[PDB]
Each structure stands twice: as structure tokens, then as C-alpha cells.
Design a protein around this ligand. Structure first.
Ligand SMILES: CCCCCCCCCCCCCCCCCC(=O)OC[C@H](COP(=O)([O-])OCC(O)COP(=O)([O-])OC[C@@H](COC(=O)CCCCCCCCCCCCCCCCC)OC(=O)CCCCCCCCCCCCCCCCC)OC(=O)CCCCCCCCCCCCCCCCC
Ligand SMILES: CCCCCCCCCCCCCCCCCC(=O)OC[C@H](COP(=O)([O-])OCC(O)COP(=O)([O-])OC[C@@H](COC(=O)CCCCCCCCCCCCCCCCC)OC(=O)CCCCCCCCCCCCCCCCC)OC(=O)CCCCCCCCCCCCCCCCC
Ligand SMILES: CCCCCCCCCCCCCCCCCC(=O)OC[C@H](COP(=O)([O-])OCC[N+](C)(C)C)OC(=O)CCCCCCCCCCCCCCCCC
Ligand SMILES: CCCCCCCCCCCCCCCCCC(=O)OC[C@H](COP(=O)([O-])OCC[N+](C)(C)C)OC(=O)CCCCCCCCCCCCCCCCC
Ligand SMILES: CCCCCCCCCCCCCCCCCCCC(=O)O[C@H](COC(=O)CCCCCCCCCCCCCC)COP(=O)(O)OCCN
Ligand code: HEC
Ligand code: HEC
Ligand code: HEM
Ligand code: HEM
Ligand code: HEM
Ligand code: HEM
Lengths: 244, 54, 85, 383, 383, 244
């Protein structure tokens, strides 16, 4: 295939979580949630994440309950069987911007903005792809590219023509921790956040792996000693043959 | 050192008891040791490190 | 074709005397350094060709094919691609 | 008489795992048998556990796998363990078949364990294909679509058979629920055949790397191969650990994290990596039915090794020419694997066909010729 | 030498189903073993088929069973066949256990097949209990609730274990999905144990209705018992037909056609008919934990028959007093079954306790006494 | 328990479908559907029955499509993602009178009228129970019965106090086949209809059972001949013993 049809492959950036012993930077995760909430959530859902998932990752229990309680969710019908709404609870999932696919496509000139809960696992490149894509809109498409109407040129997207316009510009977010909200900073944070969303076990998984590696390594070393020990009678065996 | 063999190793009942008690101790101490090690190499990154702001 | 202990189906054995020592009496890692260096080098040297020849040939084949394929799907390779289809 | 010999049940265990007489010179490539048994046990344990959390209905299946990843305690581990062990199962099975081909384990008197083994290999493929579908991601759906459409090639009845497999007119809910049930079952069928091939083997005993009789010099299975098997168990677990804990998605296709969408077709529909050589063989033949027959024949042709190997000597340890031919055969099988995942483009089209011809000519031409010639060289060479 | 003897795999089949030497005088009560094998095969085939249409999620389970009844071609038959064969499986298993107790099949040298058999019986109970839950009707849910709450009786950890079984704080989706997975599995475990008890039996050979050695007069398993087994297969299929086709719900509880409702408690929560005697034994003991222990002991006490039967003669064919005692024991077991489904009301409360005492006293008192006395009567009686 | 708490057990009426070789009377089924539609459907759903199920049982394809097309069902959203209705198709399930349980209970003084798709299987007695219950409202409760408010006395219902009032009265339905619509006639028809609804395979099941009975009977007879044939060498065996 042409390189265009594949998309340019994203650079390997040194994410804090790259590295066998490295967790996510939770401060970056928190910043990234704020980017999701103020920019991406206009078009993209995060349906597999519940408010409770943020607790003790990015937010305290209280902050997350506050986020839940601001929204209205469908309750069980009342006693006359009429529909009712209730305020959100931590068990509720973060609600999407559109009620269905058709509404989503209508608002985006036919393109359907994917749910972002898994997008870091669902594209080759992961965090790097999300970072490259958000930051990789050139001012002008390379001369000779014909964009379909409502498409934007982005070399990292396969085919080049992406239905999502550039959305991160310096200072679209005001971070609550005083970090300068540059395009690059926001893309890094949101890409980290989405990576966490796709694999929330990441931190625990790598710690258990460290324990496993250590125990299994020691057992492997000992199994070699024990094998050699038990086999030495066979390896050391000597013969004397006297033809009869 | 004959003494050590005689007490902990000679009877298999004693040897298996020793191995399981050692596994208990190892399991508890290894858990604690890795926890501390993990927190040092990932310093300022984890929720416990930023939680104090809230 | 195979029996069991005591009637394994060996031709009669006579006049082979077999000697060995206890695992506790032996050094399990005796001459390990010599073996790890010299013995492994000997065994690897003797098998090297049988691995290197097919690997190098098929890697070269793949390299040539992947490079041609890449080149055909450039601007420069437009004409050669048109003929190839 | 010792209890382990006296009691009929214990004695069956004894005959397989303890007093079993083994050659005293088995090398590490005889350890794949036990690794495959370990994979089979891991797959049963993790698989049955996933089944406790998975929902087979197409409306819920993908979400149930996300629920396992996100909500179930250690669900991530059990899911990744099951998915990665499926890859290791094929690495070990190819290694085991490779060992058997190199050392002539398929020759008399071991044709029966070999032939049952070829069926085990087919069941593993079916098991792993159905298991892949259960995720009901994009690759799940599109892989099921394309692979089940191969049955459309069967003349006269093909179309009807496909609709019968699907339970429907496309891959959807009925297909998913049936694959769940069968994917659960197939590993038990596979375990039975694995046991049968061992029972068949027990009449001749294991071959050994010299290819001579070991009746002259036997060693109890335990403790010697018990403790030797531990080394590869721990080496395997180290490799398992590096995948499952540190790179759980290295062997995976990202597209399987997108829910199945019958409208959107993924860029490239390729099978899981371990089926790729068979996929390359299928693409090589232009005819639809031809392609399917070739693909099946690529597996069933293993059944003729006992016939086409004309050597008077068992295995390749002492046969320089056979060893070179085997090296080329193995590397070609890997090239087929690679060509299974490239795009159908020049120059890989012609290359795929040449590799497929080499694959078949090994069994049909080269092995019979080379084995005949080496027979003569050994005889004239030692005169 | 004939192939069926030469080839190791065929020879295993041969040793069990063809050349197997059987006593020449087995009566029709030796046919339950093969009927149980037929039930097990029917349950596997119908069960695996239902699994292709059933959905384990609590939101869909009951409806998936309705879908099987209404939409799936012959779904009604497969569902009813599976449900009714579960009843026939217990009729046949009780018959088989009855045969074994009457004819002293539990005595040396057959203690091991007997004891493995007691475990098969426990697995059958667990299998059938879990399968019943899968419908997720009212009886499914409430039966699971009350039976799983028995584990709450285990001291200290009981409550924690129940929450662990349920995967939750009540019976709900997690419980249903795990019972699906285990219900699928348990029949394969049961098949393995069934095979083990046969292998254990093969060392002594089948007992016979006279209780003497048959070593003096044997018959090949085929053709004689092959064709004798056909008669009961067709008699069984006739009984199967009358239930499945003409009265498919005679053995069922209507309440299981109401979807599970955790709020509404059904009138009377009773187990399936075949578990009723154990339920009566449980009710007999006032203490919660006592009741559970008694219920388990009612099954595990079968393991002491080899010890408490002191007879020098195998089985009851020639023992008039033992035959009367056995008759009363069997009828009491049926009365317990009946009292398992009555309401906890006078006068059935006291009656249930008396029957429970009779049940245990058979093993612990009467059989040891009667068997000792008959020994003496045979000796003095023949002087 | 007291007889009251159990409910009076319904008589065994001679239904046309009782009898190993008997089908439902389909004319009665059709009449019973008309009773369901004009009386019971006000309160009771029949959610497991689709329009297609009536076809070739009680109605032709055309009659059933007419029934479906009169109703509105939820369609897939339109292109602006707004909800839409469509006319019914044969694949659609017969729709219920109430949107949820709460609405159902509110309309029935707290009692929830059960779905009737399975009610013939879900009660001891089946058709007989439904017939007895519909026809078994006495003019006056037996002296001394205290009914809870909004309950009606019916001896067949366990406890006696049922939340469903008498609903069948002579001529509430006008049958299209000219059959006199008496309370008993309507109860018989609707009870037959509901029995069909619970077990729609009934007719086919009994026919296949007849075939099975015949084949299995013949095989049983032959298996006895064959057993006796093959066993005769063993049965007929004779011995002569001469002590050595
Ligand atoms: C997967 C799951 C993980 C678990 C690990 C299992 C892998 C173990 C195994 O079977 O392979 C190890 C295996 C060691 O087995 P071994 O019992 O020492 O010898 C088996 C052969 O006879 C060894 O043949 P040899 O005695 O002729 O020695 C040959 C070997 C040297 O063997 C070693 O000791 C290494 O060197 C090579 O052939 C290297 C090729 C040259 C490349 C440059 O290593 C190899 O044989 C590698 C060569 C394969 C091509
Ligand atoms: C359930 C699935 C359906 C499949 C059917 C399988 C059932 C077949 C079976 O095992 O029982 C038939 C079985 C016929 O077996 P057989 O091999 O002819 O003789 C077995 C007896 O040991 C031979 O006993 P016997 O020679 O002393 O004959 C005793 C039998 C007479 O047996 C007759 O068949 C006549 O008569 C009675 O015990 C009737 C009791 C008096 C009631 C009045 O019927 C009985 O003898 C039932 C007696 C149980 C009480
Ligand atoms: C990659 C190419 C591999 C070619 C191997 C050639 C032999 C060699 O050097 O191997 C070392 C050794 C040589 O061992 P050997 O037993 O021949 O010799 C031992 C040493 N002498 C001769 C002195 C007794 O070979 C093996 O151990 C081969 C096992 C084959 C496993 C193949 C797996 C491939 C999967 C494809 C499945 C279809
Ligand atoms: C109901 C009561 C049954 C009592 C049986 C007494 C013996 C009898 O008459 O049976 C006929 C026959 C008598 O056979 P028999 O073998 O004693 O005598 C044959 C004829 N003679 C004596 C001349 C050699 O008994 C059986 O066949 C008994 C099998 C018992 C099966 C019980 C199933 C019950 C389930 C309970 C599970 C816990
Ligand atoms: C079934 C799948 C088999 C694969 C096992 C490999 C690792 C999985 C263990 C889970 C895990 O993450 O454990 C870690 C330690 O690993 C380890 O130390 C485990 C590696 C040990 C290798 C295998 C040894 C026996 C395992 C199989 C036997 C099971 C049945 C026998 C009774 C840390 O977890 P943690 O330490 O926080 O855990 C709490 C107790 N402190
Ligand atoms: C107002 C619209 C809009 C906003 C704001 C928006 N997106 Fe998107 N996004 C889209 C649409 C539409 C697509 C689908 C593009 C296509 O398929 O052509 C999309 C696609 C994506 C994709 C996947 C592209 C692919 O490979 O399929 C990612 C990742 C993504 N968006 C992330 C983000 C992040 C991160 C933000 C903001 C921080 C963001 N989006 C803001 C509309 C938006
Ligand atoms: C306007 C209300 C209403 C009408 C009309 C109505 N029902 Fe009911 N029905 C109920 C209510 C309410 C219950 C629940 C009674 C209770 O649980 O106390 C019920 C219960 C039943 C039950 C089950 C009783 C039980 O055992 O749980 C059956 C069967 C039944 N109805 C059938 C019918 C049939 C047949 C018709 C008419 C041909 C009918 N119903 C008409 C309201 C109605
Ligand atoms: C689940 C898959 C399998 C398991 C668990 C399994 C297990 C084993 C085990 C334990 C042995 C004995 C020890 C050893 O040589 O490694 C063995 C030997 C053998 N297996 Fe497998 N096997 C499997 C699949 C296969 C397949 C797919 C084949 C062939 C295509 C095969 C053919 C053989 C042969 C021929 C032997 C005898 C080899 C010899 O010892 O010389 N097996 N297998
Ligand atoms: C030889 C044994 C087995 C093999 C090779 C195998 C292979 C696979 C594969 C490849 C998948 C796709 C995994 C993924 O990418 O997520 C899978 C999924 C699954 N398998 Fe298996 N499997 C085996 C045994 C079993 C058994 C015994 C069960 C018991 C039910 C089972 C249950 C499942 C379930 C529920 C899934 C879906 C959940 C998931 O994707 O993880 N498997 N299997
Ligand atoms: C799946 C359930 C079972 C199957 C398929 C099965 C099958 C068989 C078969 C085929 C036989 C040999 C023929 C016969 O005597 O009928 C047999 C014998 C026997 N079974 Fe079972 N059985 C099962 C369950 C049990 C149970 C629950 C018990 C005991 C509690 C049991 C104890 C025995 C004993 C003791 C024998 C030897 C009896 C004799 O021949 O004297 N089995 N079984
Ligand atoms: C000993 C073998 C088995 C027994 C005794 C058994 C027993 C039962 C019972 C009593 C039920 C309740 C039936 C009902 O009232 O509807 C049931 C349901 C079920 N069983 Fe089994 N079963 C067995 C084997 C299997 C197997 C191997 C499967 C394979 C999956 C299976 C799958 C099911 C399913 C899916 C249901 C739920 C659908 C239904 O209720 O019909 N069963 N089983």
C-alpha cells in the first residue's frame, strides 16, 4: 500500500509509563481528565469508565461524587409508572454527548466520533498515536492532497483525511495546577489519560509482574541447581566393557 | 550444624513445616519490601504522592 | 517393542560394568565453566551452517521482496507497478 | 508388591508419570510435551474462569470481556493469561511437531501417536479459531466471516452449509453462542486425543535424539524428567510473565478492541499469527476450492511423512543433507507465515506461490529423494 | 494375534466392551450401568445443544430458555429431553445404587468402585442442582438461595463462603453465570469418575446375583450383554418418549415457569424430586449446622457399608432377614422423599424425624446386628 | 395448610387436547384469541407471542399482517437521530397494555396482572385452572370471608382473595363465527388459547410422539426376539458331571 493509505507512523515518545517499572504520572492523568472533560467530551464518549474509576487515581471520593451529582440519570419509574431522573452516584458511568449514533453523525458532518475508552488499545501506536494525531494537523495540507468536504488533513490518520478538526490550541484549557496549557502539554496529558482509561490495571499489573519476575527467576535458578544435583549420577556414570 | 539438620530437616514433617513457615514469612516481607521499592522508583507519580493536595 | 522394568526387551547384556557416585558425593557444577565456554562453543560451531544458511537465504529473500514492494508503491515505482498488475 | 504397582488406578498413573521407562538421553526438545500439557491446563483453568464472567450473547459479549478486564478481580490477568497462553500453546505445538519431524518420531513404530497428533493439531486450530470469535471485536467478526465463507467452496451444498454453521445469513448472535458452546467443549475433546496419543506412544516408548533403541538404557520418568521438566516450566513462566504482565497486547490485533461492526470492514483481515502459514497457502492457489483443499492438505500431508521418508535411519541427527533440507523447510514455513500477513501485492503474490510449492515439494519430492540418496551414501560411505 | 488384541488403543476398548468377561447370570438390574451411560450421553448431547442457545446473563436467561422452547427448531424437544433425562438419570442411579446395596457390590473386593461411586453420586447432585438454577425461574432462584444459605452454617467462615459462591450479596447474575460454567464442566468431571469406577471394577469383575465367584463361568460382554442392554435401552426410550412427548411437565414444578423475582417468595420452596430425601433428613435436625451435617452424612455414610456389613456371604439373595430389612430401608427412603415435599406441619414433623432415625440406624445398628445374626444362623442352620 | 390457603383444586374438564392423539381445536383457539384481544388484553400482556405465531394456527398471513400493521412500534432513529415509529410487522411481538410494572400496578389497585404467555404452564392445573378461575366467581363470598379492599372472592385462587374482578359476562365478546358467547364458552376458548400460547409445539409434539411410540415399540419387540435368539445357546446349555 501507499504510505498515505497506511498513515505516517507516530514517533516513539518517552511516556512516563514506558519502562518495565514505571507507573503513569497521576498528576498528568488528572490534567488529562480535565482536557477530556473540557475538549473531547463535546464529541466523544467515555462509556466504559465509571465515576468510581477516577477515585484514587485522579480524584478523591468527594471530587468524584461532586462530578456525578451534577448530572441527571434515568431512575426507576415512579409509583404511577412515570419516568424519573435522579442525581448521579459513583457507580454511574460517565455519560456521552449524544443519545445515539445517528445524532453523533449528524453533529459531525457524517463522521462518528468513536468512544475513547479503548482507543489507546484499539489503534497501532497507542498513546503515541493519540499524541501524534492531536498535534499533527499541519497548517496547510501537502500540495496536491484533495480533501473530501468536511475532512481535515492529518498525516497520522490512515488516508490522511480525518473528520475531526484540530481542537487543541494554546490555552483552550486552564489547568488547575498552573501547568502552562500548550497544545503539546494538553495532548500529552489527554493521551496519558486515555491510555489509563484503556488499561486501568496498568500500574498494579506492572508491580505484580515485578514480583513474579523475581520469584520465577529465583525458582528458575534453583530448578537448575536441583536438576543438576539430581542428574549428576547419570551424567557422571562411567563404564568398563570386557567383551565376554 | 548437625543440630540444624536434625531439628529442621531430618523429619519431613518438620522440613515441610519449616518450608511453609518460611513461605509465610517470605510472602509477608517480600510484599512489604516490593511495596517500598515500587514507591521509591515511582516517586511523585502515584496517587498517594499527589493525594495530599486534596 | 518396549517391555517394562525387568523385561525391557534389550538384547542380553553381559560384561558392561557401570559405576556412578551419589548426588550428595558429587559436585553438581563440576567443570561448569569449561563446559559453558568450550563445550558450548564446540557444539554451536558444529551446527552453525545448518542454521545460518537457511536463515540468511530466507532473510535475504524477504528483504528483497519487502524492498521491491515498498519501492513499487512510491511515485518512482508507478510505472513498474502498473506493469506488475 | 508396592501399592503404586498393585492398585489398578495408581498403577495407571505410575505407568505414565513415575516408573515410565524413558531413554536416558532425551534433550530439551523433549520438554515441549509437558509444556503443551501445562498450556492445556492453564487454558482450562483460565478458560473456565473466563466462562464464569463472559456472556455469549452478541449484544453483551464484547462488553462482558471489557467487564472482565475492568471489574472482575484479577480479570485482567485471567483474560491476558488465556489470550497469551493461546499463543504459547502454538509456539509449543510447532516446536513439538518440529522435534517430531526432525527426529523422525513419525517413523514406525510410532506412526499411530504421530497420526493422532495430526488430529490434535487440527482440533487446536479449530479451538483457537472459535475462541478468537468470542471476543466479538472487529477481527473476531471479520475473521469469522472470511473463514466460514471458505466452506461456501464445497460444491453444491457449500452455501447451505455456511448458513447452517452461522445459524443465520451472516455471522451474528447464533454464531457467537454456538461458538461459545463449542469452544468450551473442544479443549476437552483435545485433551482426550492428547491422552490417546500418549497411550499409543506407550507401546514403543519415546524416541530419542540418536534414533537408536533405548531399550538398552532406561531411566525412570521421575525423578529425572520430572526435575528436567521443571526447568522448562520456569523458563516458560518467565516468558509468560514478560508477555502477560509487561506487554500483554504485543501478540494481539488492536482491531479486536473495536466492537464488531458489520458495516465497517477492517483494513486487512488476517488470522491470528499462528494460522498465518496456512493462510498464505490458501492465497497461493487462485481457485477458491483449490485454495481450501491446499490449505487442508498442508496439514493432512503430515500424515504421509511415515511413507515418504525412505530412510533406513531414524531422524536427522546423523544426516547432514536431511538437516539442511529440514532447515530450509522450517524457514520456508516461517516465510509463509510472514506472507500470510502482507497485503496481496507484488511481489509477494509470486513469492507466496513459490513458497507454497516449496512447502509441498518437501513432502512429495525432496524428502523421498534425499532420504533415498542418503541411504546409499551411508552404505557406500562406510564400505 | 487379532487386531483388537494387538493394537493398544483397540485393546482398551476390547477389554471393556467386547472381550470383557462377565458372569453368565447377570439379571436385568445389571442393566442400569449402561442406562446411566446412555443418560450421560443424552445429557451431554442435549446439554451442549442447549448451551448453543442459552444465555447465561440473568437479564436474558429465562428468556433464552423460552426462545429455545418457542423459536429454535426442535428446541422444545431438546429442552424437554434434557430436563426429563435429568429425572431418569436419578431414577437409574438410585436403581443402580439399590442393586449394589442389595447384592453386596460394596463388599471386598469391590470397595474401591463403590467408594468412587459415592463421589459420582455427589457430583451428579451438584450437577443437577446447578443445572436447575440456570432456568432462572422462581424455583431456580429460591432453590439456589436456600441451598446456598446452608453453607452459612459452617462456623466462622460460613457467611464469607456464601458471598464467595454467589459472587455477590444475593443470588443474581454472577451466581447464574458461574453456575452455567460449572454446570457445563461438572458432567465431564462426572464422566471421568464414572470411567474410574469402571477401571477400578475391572480388577474384580462384576459381581453377580448369586454372590459367588463367576471365574468358573464367564461370557463375553458382546454379544450377550450388548443385546441384553438393548432391551432396556428400548424400554427406557419408551418411558422417555411418554414423558418427553406426552407429558413433558409431569416431573416439573410450575413455579419454574414464572421468571425469578427476588421480592416474591414462592409458596413452598422444595428441591427437585430426586433430592427430596436429603431435604427431609435436613429438616429432621432442628440445629442449622446439625441439619447440614446430617444431610451430608446421609450420603457419606454409604462409604461405611463395606465395614458395617459383617456377613460372610455376599449380597441378599439368600438372606431372608437382610432382604426384609432392605425392603424396609428402601421404603423408608421413599417415605423420606415424600416427607421432603410436605409442609412443615404436624404430624409430619415427628414422622420425618423417626424416618431419619430409621435411615441412619440401618447403617449403624441394624445391618451390623442382622448380618452378625445371619452368619450364626447359616452356620448352626446347616450343621 | 388449610384448603383455603391452597385454593380449591379445579375440576378435570375434558379439553379437546386431552388425549394422547388429540390436537387443539383450532377453531376454539381462534375464538380464544378474540377473547384475549377484547377482554384480557386490557390488563394482561402476551409478550412471548409474535404476530407470526398466530399465522397458520389461528389466522392467515394476511389477517395477522393486518393486526400488526394497525399498531405503531419503535423504529431505529431517523437521520437527525430523532425517535421514530413504524407500523408493525409479523416479526413483532404482541404489545402489552402497560409500559412497565409500576404503571400496571397503578391501574390495578396495586396488583400486577401477570403476563399470560406462560400462565397455563405456570399454575397447577393448567387450562383447568384458568377455566375454573374465570368462571368461579360466586355472586357472594362464603359467609365469614373478609376480603382485603380491592380483592374479589374466588375459591380457586390460593387464599381466596384475587385482585382480578370477574370480567367474563354473557355477550362481552361477539364471536365472528356465530358461536353464542356465554361465560362458559368464552372461558373455555380463552383457556384453550392460553394453553396454546404456553405450549405452541403441542400439536407437532404429540404427532412426533406417536411416530416415536410406534417405532420404539417395534424395536422393543424385535430387541426381545433378538436377545432371546442370541441367548438361546446359553439358556439351553446342559451339563454332565462325572466326579474325577
Ligand atoms: C517456548 C517456551 C520457553 C521454554 C524454553 C524451551 C526451549 C528449550 C529447547 O528445547 O531448546 C534449548 C536447546 C538446548 O537443548 P540441549 O538439550 O542442550 O541440546 C539439544 C540439542 O541436541 C543441542 O544440539 P547440539 O548438542 O548440536 O548443540 C547445538 C546448539 C548448542 O546447544 C546449547 O547448549 C544451547 O547450538 C546451536 O545449534 C546454535 C545454532 C548456531 C547459531 C549461530 O538449545 C538448542 O538446542 C538450540 C538450537 C536450536 C536450533
Ligand atoms: C427405569 C427405566 C426403564 C428400564 C427398565 C429396566 C428395569 C428392569 C429391571 O431391572 O427389572 C426387571 C426385573 C426382571 O429382572 P430378571 O432379570 O428377570 O430377574 C431379576 C430378579 O432378580 C429375579 O427375581 P425373581 O427371580 O425372584 O423374580 C421376582 C419378581 C418376578 O420377576 C419377573 O419378571 C416376573 O417378582 C417380584 O418380586 C414381584 C413382587 C410381588 C408383587 C405383588 O423385574 C423384577 O424382577 C423386579 C422385582 C423388584 C422388586
Ligand atoms: C531455524 C532453522 C532450524 C534448523 C535446525 C538444524 C539443526 C541444528 O543445528 O539444530 C541444533 C540441534 C542439533 O541436535 P542433534 O540432536 O541433531 O545433534 C546433537 C549433537 N550430536 C550430533 C553430536 C549428537 O537440533 C535440534 O535440537 C533440532 C530440533 C528442531 C525444532 C524445530 C522447530 C521449528 C517449528 C516448525 C514446525 C512445522
Ligand atoms: C420396594 C421394596 C423392594 C424390596 C426388595 C426385596 C427382594 C425382592 O423381592 O426383589 C426381587 C428380586 C429378588 O432377586 P434375588 O436375586 O434375591 O433372587 C432371585 C431368585 N433366587 C432367590 C431363586 C436366586 O430382587 C432384586 O432383583 C432386587 C434389586 C433391588 C433394587 C432396589 C431399588 C431401590 C432404590 C433405593 C436407593 C437408595
Ligand atoms: C493459573 C495461571 C498460572 C501462571 C502463574 C504466574 C504468576 C501469577 C501469579 C499472580 C501474581 O501476580 O502473583 C505475583 C507473584 O507471582 C508469583 O510469585 C507467582 C509465580 C509462581 C510460579 C508458579 C508456582 C506455582 C503456581 C501454580 C500452582 C497453583 C496450584 C497449586 C496449589 C504477585 O501477587 P501477590 O504476591 O500480590 O499475591 C498476594 C499474596 N501476597
Ligand atoms: C467537535 C468534534 C470533536 C472534538 C472536539 C474532538 N474530536 Fe476526536 N474525533 C471526532 C470525529 C468526527 C472523529 C472521527 C474521524 C473520522 O473517522 O474521520 C474523531 C476521531 C478521534 C480519534 C480516532 C481517530 C481514529 O484513528 O479513528 C481519536 C483518538 C480522537 N478523536 C481523540 C480526540 C481527543 C483526545 C480530543 C480532544 C482532546 C478529540 N478527539 C476532540 C470529533 C471530535
Ligand atoms: C381490568 C383487569 C383485568 C382484566 C380485564 C383481566 N385480568 Fe386477569 N388479572 C388481573 C390482576 C390484577 C391479576 C392479579 C391478581 C392477583 O395477583 O391478586 C390477574 C390475574 C390473572 C391470572 C392468574 C391468577 C394467578 O393464579 O396468579 C390469570 C390466569 C388471569 N388473570 C387471566 C385473565 C383472563 C383469561 C382474562 C380475561 C379473559 C383476564 N385475566 C382479565 C387483572 C385483569
Ligand atoms: C495438546 C497437544 C499435545 C500434548 C499435550 C502432547 C504431549 C506429548 C507428550 C507429553 C509426549 C511425550 C513426551 C515428549 O516427547 O515431549 C508427546 C510425544 C509425542 N507427541 Fe505429542 N502432544 C501434543 C500434540 C501433539 C501433536 C500435535 C503431535 C503431532 C502432530 C504430537 C505427536 C507426538 C509424537 C509423535 C510423540 C512421540 C515423540 C517421541 O517421544 O519420540 N503431539 N506428546
Ligand atoms: C486449548 C484450549 C484453549 C485455547 C487454545 C483457547 C483459545 C482462546 C482464544 C485464542 C481466545 C481469544 C482470546 C482473546 O483474544 O481475548 C479465547 C477466548 C475465550 N476462551 Fe478459550 N481457549 C481454550 C480453552 C478454553 C476453555 C476450556 C474455555 C472454557 C470455557 C475457554 C473459554 C474462553 C472464553 C470464555 C473466551 C472469551 C473471553 C476472552 O476473549 O478472553 N477457552 N480462547
Ligand atoms: C454416571 C453414573 C454411573 C455410571 C454411568 C455407572 C456405570 C456402571 C457400569 C457400566 C457398571 C458395570 C455394569 C453394571 O453393573 O451395571 C457399574 C458397576 C458399578 N457401579 Fe456404577 N455407574 C455409575 C454411578 C455409580 C454410582 C453412583 C455407584 C455407587 C454409589 C456405582 C457403583 C458401582 C458399583 C459398586 C459397581 C459394581 C457393581 C457390580 O457389578 O457388582 N456406580 N457402573
Ligand atoms: C449429568 C449431566 C447433566 C445433568 C444431570 C443436567 C441437569 C440439568 C437440569 C436438571 C437442568 C434443569 C433443566 C430444566 O428444568 O429446564 C439443566 C439445564 C441445563 N443444562 Fe444441564 N445437565 C447435565 C449436563 C449438561 C451439559 C453437559 C450441558 C452442557 C452445557 C448442560 C447444559 C444445560 C443448560 C444450558 C441448561 C439450561 C437450559 C435448560 O434449563 O434447559 N447440561 N441441566
Amino acid at each position: 500500500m501507499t504510505a498515505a493509505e497506511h498513515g505516517l507512523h507516530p514517533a516513539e515518545y518517552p511516556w512516563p509509563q514506558n519502562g518495565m517499572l514505571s507507573t503513569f504520572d497521576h498528576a498528568s492523568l488528572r490534567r488529562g481528565y480535565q482536557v477530556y472533560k473540557e475538549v473531547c467530551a463535546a464529541c466523544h464518549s467515555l462509556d466504559r469508565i465509571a465515576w468510581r474509576n477516577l477515585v484514587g487515581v485522579t480524584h478523591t471520593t468527594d471530587e468524584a461524587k461532586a462530578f456525578a451529582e451534577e448530572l441527571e440519570y434515568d431512575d426507576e419509574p415512579d409509583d404511577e409508572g412515570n419516568p424519573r431522573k435522579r442525581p448521579g452516584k459513583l457507580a454511574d458511568y460517565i455519560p456521552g454527548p449524544y443519545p445515539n449514533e445517528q445524532a453523533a453523525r449528524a453533529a459531525n458532518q457524517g463522521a462518528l466520533p468513536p468512544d475513547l475508552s479503548l482507543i489507546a488499545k484499539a489503534r497501532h501506536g497507542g498513546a503515541d498515536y493519540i499524541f501524534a494525531l492531536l498535534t499533527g494537523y499541519p497548517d496547510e495540507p501537502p500540495a496536491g492532497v484533495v480533501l473530501a468536504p468536511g475532512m481535515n488533513y492529518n498525516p497520522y490518520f490512515p488516508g490522511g483525511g480525518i473528520g475531526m478538526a484540530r481542537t487543541l490550541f494554546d490555552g483552550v484549557v486552564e489547568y488547575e495546577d498552573g501547568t502552562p496549557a500548550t497544545t503539546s502539554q494538553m495532548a500529552k496529558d489527554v493521551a496519558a489519560f486515555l491510555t489509563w482509561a484503556a488499561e486501568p490495571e496498568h500500574d498494579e499489573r506492572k508491580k505484580l509482574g515485578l514480583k513474579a519476575i523475581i520469584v520465577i527467576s529465583a525458582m528458575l535458578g534453583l530448578s537448575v541447581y536441583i536438576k543438576k544435583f539430581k542428574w549428576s549420577p547419570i551424567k557422571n556414570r562411567k563404564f568398563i566393557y570386557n567383551p565376554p | 550444624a548437625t543440630t540444624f539438620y536434625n531439628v529442621f530437616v531430618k523429619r519431613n514433617s518438620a522440613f515441610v513445616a519449616t518450608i511453609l513457615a518460611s513461605a509465610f514469612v517470605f510472602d509477608m516481607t517480600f510484599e512489604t519490601a516490593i511495596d517500598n521499592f515500587w514507591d521509591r522508583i515511582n516517586a511523585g507519580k502515584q496517587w498517594k504522592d499527589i493525594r495530599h493536595k486534596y | 517393542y518396549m517391555g517394562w522394568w525387568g523385561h525391557m526387551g534389550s538384547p542380553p547384556q553381559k560384561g558392561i560394568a557401570g559405576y556412578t557416585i551419589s548426588p550428595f558425593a558429587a559436585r553438581p557444577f563440576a567443570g561448569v565453566v569449561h563446559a559453558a565456554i568450550f563445550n558450548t562453543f564446540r557444539r554451536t560451531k558444529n551446527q552453525a551452517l545448518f542454521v545460518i544458511l537457511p536463515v540468511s537465504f530466507f532473510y535475504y529473500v524477504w528483504t528483497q521482496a519487502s524492498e521491491k514492494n515498498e519501492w513499487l508503491y512510491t511515485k518512482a515505482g508507478r510505472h513498474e507497478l502498473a506493469k506488475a498488475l | 508388591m508396592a501399592l503404586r504397582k498393585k492398585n489398578s488406578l495408581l498403577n495407571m498413573a505410575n505407568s505414565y508419570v513415575l516408573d515410565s521407562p524413558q531413554p536416558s538421553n532425551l534433550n530439551y526438545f523433549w520438554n515441549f510435551g509437558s509444556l503443551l500439557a501445562l498450556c492445556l491446563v492453564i487454558q482450562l483453568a483460565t478458560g473456565i474462569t473466563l466462562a464464569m464472567h463472559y456472556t455469549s450473547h452478541a449484544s453483551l459479549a464484547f462488553d462482558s470481556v471489557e467487564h472482565i478486564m475492568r471489574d472482575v478481580n484479577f480479570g485482567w490477568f485471567i483474560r491476558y493469561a488465556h489470550a497469551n497462553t493461546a499463543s504459547f500453546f502454538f509456539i509449543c505445538i510447532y516446536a513439538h511437531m518440529g522435534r517430531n519431524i526432525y527426529y523422525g518420531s513419525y517413523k514406525t513404530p510410532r506412526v499411530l501417536p504421530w497420526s493422532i497428533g495430526v488430529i490434535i493439531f487440527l482440533l487446536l486450530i479449530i479451538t483457537a479459531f472459535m475462541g478468537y470469535v468470542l471476543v466479538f471485536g472487529q477481527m473476531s467478526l471479520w475473521g469469522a466471516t472470511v473463514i466460514c465463507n471458505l466452506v461456501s467452496a464445497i460444491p453444491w451444498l457449500g452455501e447451505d452449509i455456511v448458513h447452517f454453521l452461522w445459524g443465520g445469513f451472516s455471522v451474528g448472535n447464533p454464531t457467537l453462542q454456538r461458538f461459545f458452546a463449542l469452544h468450551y467443549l473442544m479443549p476437552f475433546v483435545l485433551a482426550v486425543f492428547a491422552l490417546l496419543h500418549l497411550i499409543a506412544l506407550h507401546t514403543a516408548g519415546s524416541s530419542n535424539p540418536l534414533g537408536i533403541t533405548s531399550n538398552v538404557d532406561k531411566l525412570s520418568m521421575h525423578p529425572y524428567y520430572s526435575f528436567k521438566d521443571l526447568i522448562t516450566v520456569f523458563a516458560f513462566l518467565l516468558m509468560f510473565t514478560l508477555f502477560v504482565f509487561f506487554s500483554p497486547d504485543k501478540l494481539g490485533h488492536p482491531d479486536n478492541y473495536i466492537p464488531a461492526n458489520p458495516m465497517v470492514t477492517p483494513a486487512s483481515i488476517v488470522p491470528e499469527w499462528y494460522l498465518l502459514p496456512f493462510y498464505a497457502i490458501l492465497r497461493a492457489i487462485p481457485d477458491k476450492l483449490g485454495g481450501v483443499i491446499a490449505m487442508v492438505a498442508a496439514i493432512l500431508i503430515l500424515l504421509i511423512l511415515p511413507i515418504v521418508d525412505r530412510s533406513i535411519i531414524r531422524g536427522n541427527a546423523f544426516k547432514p543433507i536431511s538437516k539442511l533440507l529440514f532447515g530450509f523447510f522450517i524457514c520456508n514455513f516461517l516465510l509463509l507465515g510472514v506472507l500470510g500477513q502482507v497485503h496481496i501485492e507484488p511481489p509477494f503474490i509470486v513469492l507466496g506461490q513459490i513458497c507454497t510449492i516449496f512447502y509441498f515439494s518437501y513432502f512429495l519430492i525432496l524428502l523421498p529423494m534425499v532420504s533415498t540418496i542418503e541411504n546409499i551414501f551411508f552404505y557406500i560411505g562406510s564400505l
